[PDB]
Amino acid sequence: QIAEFKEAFSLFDKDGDGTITTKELGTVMRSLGQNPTEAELQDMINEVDADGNGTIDFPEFLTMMARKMKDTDSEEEIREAFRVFDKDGNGYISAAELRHVMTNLGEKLTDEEVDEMIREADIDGDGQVNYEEFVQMMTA
């Protein structure tokens, strides 16, 4: 979803350098049917780019995309919980991840309670918890 934008970014860059120039922007804007001011295009490049050299990488776009996310509050809170529970950032919550956030958060449970939460949250039987299994417990 987040990475699925950049194919149209392949339609953005005409040179093929990973750096959107002003001439490619003017070409696609004239292809859009509009005749914009190139000074305003330089303004849009300087506001969009973090490199500030007349061209921007897609990581420089990623902050503007995260600003343009503007999703729901509940999914953002649960995504924050999923990001702080997955310390590996692999989209999966290990039992060691649950034990380490039990120690770091303060709520200390026994190891059987860790495996109990793992076995109760998991449905498909993989020893780890996905985001849908996460919101299954975030619902109640």
């Binding site: 934008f5 194919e7 149209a8 339609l11 953005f12 005409k14 490619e24 070409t27 696609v28 004239r30 292809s31 859009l32 049917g33 509009q34 849009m44 506001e47 969009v48 776009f61 503007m64 995309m65 600003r67 343009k68 503007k70």
Partner: protein, 94 residues
Amino acid sequence: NEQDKVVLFLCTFSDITAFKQPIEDDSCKGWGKFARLTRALTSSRGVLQQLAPSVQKGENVHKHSRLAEVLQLGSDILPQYKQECVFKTTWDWI
């Protein structure tokens, strides 16, 4: 129809946001709304207006070509919601 009755309607769609004008009730920036407009009209611009980012006047060429693709699709609206040899036997006998 086969009975020539007007039984169904077909409404085909595309995204003409970048082609006409960007207008937002609210947005983060002009580039952000412009980026959302380009990401929305992806299959319009991408797999139809292929060589059109090199050329100018896309409203005169590529948007007209997408409308003509819709015109050829209306030419292909002919299925009309309906169901769509003894010489070989005698030939094999002889």
